[PDB]
Amino acid sequence: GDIVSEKKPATEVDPTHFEKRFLKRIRDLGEGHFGKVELCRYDPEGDNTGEQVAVKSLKPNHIADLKKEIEILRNLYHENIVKYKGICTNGIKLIMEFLPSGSLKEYLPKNKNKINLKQQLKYAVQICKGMDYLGSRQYVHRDLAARNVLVESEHQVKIGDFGLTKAIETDKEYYTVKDDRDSPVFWYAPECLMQSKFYIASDVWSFGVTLHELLTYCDSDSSPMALFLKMIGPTHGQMTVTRLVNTLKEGKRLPCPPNCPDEVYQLMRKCWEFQPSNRTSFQNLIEGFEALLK
Numbered sequence: 409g410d411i412v413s414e415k416k417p418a419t420e421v422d423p424t425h426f427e428k429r430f431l432k433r434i435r436d437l438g439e440g441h442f443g444k445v446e447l448c449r450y451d452p453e454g455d456n457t458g459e460q461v462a463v464k465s466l467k468p469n470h471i472a473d474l475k476k477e478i479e480i481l482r483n484l485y486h487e488n489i490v491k492y493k494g495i496c497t498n499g500i501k502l503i504m505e506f507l508p509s510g511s512l513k514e515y516l517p518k519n520k521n522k523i524n525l526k527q528q529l530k531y532a533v534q535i536c537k538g539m540d541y542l543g544s545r546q547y548v549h550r551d552l553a554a555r556n557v558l559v560e561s562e563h564q565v566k567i568g569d570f571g572l573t574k575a576i577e578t579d580k581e582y583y584t585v586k587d588d589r590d591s592p593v594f595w596y597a598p599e600c601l602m603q604s605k606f607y608i609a610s611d612v613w614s615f616g617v618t619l620h621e622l623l624t625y626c627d628s629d630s631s632p633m634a635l636f637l638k639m640i641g642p643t644h645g646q647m648t649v650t651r652l653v654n655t656l657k658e659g660k661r662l663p664c665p666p667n668c669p670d671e672v673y674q675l676m677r678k679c680w681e682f683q684p685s686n687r688t689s690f691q692n693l694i695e696g697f698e699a700l701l702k
């Protein structure tokens with residue numbers, strides 16, 4: 409008889425599935441390690457009215473890591489963590505909310521006049537609360553820097569990238585890394601530099617360095633890399649990291665930012681105890697900053 413064919417059921421649309429043909433590139437927002445992020449407009453109606461979204465994808469093996477990153481972000485829900493919106497699919501792109509004020513790296517140099525100490529301390533608390541949540545879900549970020557912190561508004565920041573984020577297995581304190589060549593060594597605790605081990609207290613250390621960036625308004629001439637390279641020497645090459653370890657073993661640390669009150673600076677230094685067990689916790693930090701804000 410007639411041609412037999414499949415009568416397929418009603419196809420309930422998934423709002424987290426973004427079709428490639430409607431995801432339209434506007435510009436580059438930046439890149440880190442093996443990923444890049446782009447401003448796109450998802451524009452199904454084709455009239456430039458679609459929602460603007462941030463799209464993460466691989467630069468031209470690392471597919472597996474992006475997929476793991478997507479699964480991490482999908483299940484994080486917090487006001488100081490950037491929102492997952494969906495995927496565009498072997499290959500895959502991560503679709504997130506777009507924050508037009510950019511990272512702290514761009515925002516802070518341009519907004520010194522409107523962002524006073526009080527607002528910096530509120531940003532710091534918010535960063536701590538997002539990181540404390542990440543810790544409560546048993547992850548270590550391994551890349552906490554001002555460049556990875558996005559500005560929602562004058563009053564709100566969010567941790568906006570999770571590309572090195574790893575799970576600490578239950579009943580263990582740390583994760584051991586193997587791939588370490590693109591490491592942000594100037595944001596890294598001694599146990600990360602020496603033994604390649606990552607604890608929650610190692611994110612506290614990196615937070616300390618992120619707080620320092622915040623307090624200098626991400627001035628490049630005052631960056632943790634620039635400051636450490638002045639301390640230890642700028643032309644050591646492959647010996648750079650060993651001299652960094654030796655400097656930190658000696659008790660030397662990044663100096664107090666200009667106009668940063670000592671009381672804020674002591675909270676920063678408690679992030680930089682050499683032994684992880686002696687470092688402050690994210691909740692202790694929050695209490696600390698809240699006291700200074702009262």
Ligand SMILES: N#CC[C@H]1CC[C@H](n2c(=O)[nH]c3cnc(/N=C4\C=CC=NC4=O)nc32)CC1
Binds near residue numbers: 437462
């Ligand atoms: N891949 C990768 C790492 C990743 C690259 C991009 C890096 N970045 C800047 O350097 N400057 C930036 C300015 N804006 C945004 N915006 C967003 C990033 C993610 C999600 N929603 C955004 O709205 N992002 C920036 C942040 C870090």
